[PDB]
């Protein structure tokens, strides 16, 4: 209802922002292609304008799904340059490599306990415990610790009293609580660890 009198103006402002972005890129390349190529953040802006201009001038299936997020990525990059968000973004990108090891350890412990899971998975209490990657992601859903009472009723009443209804349930429940606590801790600890790097 708004776009029927705005599509032409949307096209014009798309062209205007694309041409000012490529003019900025050319002005940055004027000082030297080596320094612009050897930079931490100018590479991202160059890739953004490169993908956008290839999708504009040449035919592309990029559609709105590429045109719009690329613009808001440029928005993020520009609003980072003004000072009072730059420190927090800087410490976020400093904190990511320390979060990488925590993520890898969590995934490895996840695999070595998902073997114990899939010993009692597959072809019974199925469709979330089978398919061997859907089982992994359902365990990830459960470790994210919200709304697993649908799962609790899914394996409910194996014998209605004890069966494996006690065993497998207490096993993956204590594994869920230990993994969730350890992961949430290790996350907040990596955060504060890299913020002590921020204020030194």
């Amino acid at each position: 209802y708004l776009g029927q009198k705005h599509y032409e103006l949307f096209s014009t402002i798309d062209d205007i922002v694309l041409t000012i972005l490529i003019c900025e890129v050319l002005l940055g390349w004027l000082n030297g292609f080596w320094i612009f190529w050897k930079d931490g953040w100018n590479i991202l802006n160059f890739a953004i304008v490169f993908i956008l201009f290839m999708g504009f001038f040449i035919k592309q299936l990029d559609m709105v799904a590429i045109t719009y997020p690329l613009r808001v990525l440029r928005l993020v990059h520009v609003c980072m340059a003004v000072e009072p968000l730059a420190r927090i973004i800087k410490v976020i990108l400093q904190s990511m490599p320390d979060l990488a090891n925590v993520m890898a350890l969590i995934l490895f412990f996840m695999l070595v306990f998902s073997v114990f899971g899939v010993t009692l998975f597959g072809a019974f209490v199925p469709k979330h415990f089978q398919n061997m990657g859907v089982a992994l992601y359902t365990l990830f859903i459960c470790i994210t610790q919200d709304g697993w009472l649908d799962i609790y009723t899914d394996f409910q009443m194996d014998e209605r009293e004890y069966a494996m209804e006690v065993g497998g349930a207490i096993y993956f429940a204590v594994f869920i609580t230990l993994g969730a606590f350890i992961g949430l801790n290790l996350f907040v600890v990596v955060v504060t660890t890299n913020l002590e790097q921020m204020m030194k």
């Binding site: 350890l105 073997v115 009692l120 919200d146």
Partner: protein, 251 residues
């Protein structure tokens, strides 16, 4: 050959243990990650259990070599004690399958699932004995700093267990003849306490208890939930934060 046999066993244990144990447990973990894999077992089920029994025979040879080995200090390693327990369970299930006959239920019974999770323990042991090389020093240091504050977290989980048991006791005492079908026994009572502890449908508990005639159990439930929730998670978060923080204060 007494101590002479022991020293021969030490040298040849180094050499042959390294070579043979590494190669055969690599192949064991290959066939065991091919085994679980609940798509390819239908492209199998006949070349799978035979190789499983073959490498279980290799593992009982490992335990035989360790039994004729140096002995008491072998039992002084907790991982080696886990090897001994895993192999006791393995020879138990192997002879249970071997004798056949029997008089109890079979054809994928609960005992079969017990043997399957025993196979999972064996697979985990294979995984842990292929990582003798290159555990990577970064995550080694991360795990070493993570395991520094063990008494604090054990005390906190002990307090969690005591508080959860007290809350389960008082709730089951207050839930008598109050449609207890969800928590009719001790296991379901502690599981429901875990669900209240883990932010899982306690609002649903409030809304289907409002359909009942008892109301004060709902303020009791929220006050218990909030005190245990805030206290425990603040305790563990703060404890582990400071636990890595003094290691941060060093090099």
């Amino acid at each position: 050959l007494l101590g002479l046999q022991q020293m021969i066993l030490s040298l040849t244990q180094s050499l042959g243990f390294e070579t043979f144990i590494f190669i055969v447990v690599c192949l064991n973990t290959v066939i065991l990650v091919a085994q679980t894999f609940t798509e390819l077992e239908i492209r199998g089920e006949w070349y799978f259990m035979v190789l499983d029994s073959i490498f279980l025979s290799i593992y009982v040879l490992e335990a035989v070599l360790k039994l004729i080995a140096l002995g008491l200090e072998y039992f002084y390693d907790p991982w080696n004690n886990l090897d001994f327990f895993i192999m006791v369970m393995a020879v138990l299930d192997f002879v249970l399958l071997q004798i056949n006959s029997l008089s109890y239920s079979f054809y994928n019974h609960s005992l079969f699932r017990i043997l399957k999770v025993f196979k999972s323990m064996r697979a985990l042991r294979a995984i842990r004995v292929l990582r003798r090389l290159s555990i990577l020093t970064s995550l080694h240091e991360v795990a070493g700093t993570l395991s520094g504050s063990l008494p604090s977290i054990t005390a906190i989980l002990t307090l969690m267990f005591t508080c959860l048991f007290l809350f389960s006791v008082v709730l089951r005492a207050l839930f008598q003849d109050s449609d207890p079908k969800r928590f009719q026994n001790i296991f379901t009572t502690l599981f429901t306490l875990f669900t209240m502890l883990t932010l899982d449908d306690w609002s649903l508990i409030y809304i289907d208890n409002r359909a009942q005639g008892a109301w004060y159990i709902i303020p009791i439930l929220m006050i218990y939930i909030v005190i245990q929730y805030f206290i425990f998670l603040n305790l563990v978060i703060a404890v582990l934060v400071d636990n890595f923080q003094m290691a941060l204060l060093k090099g």
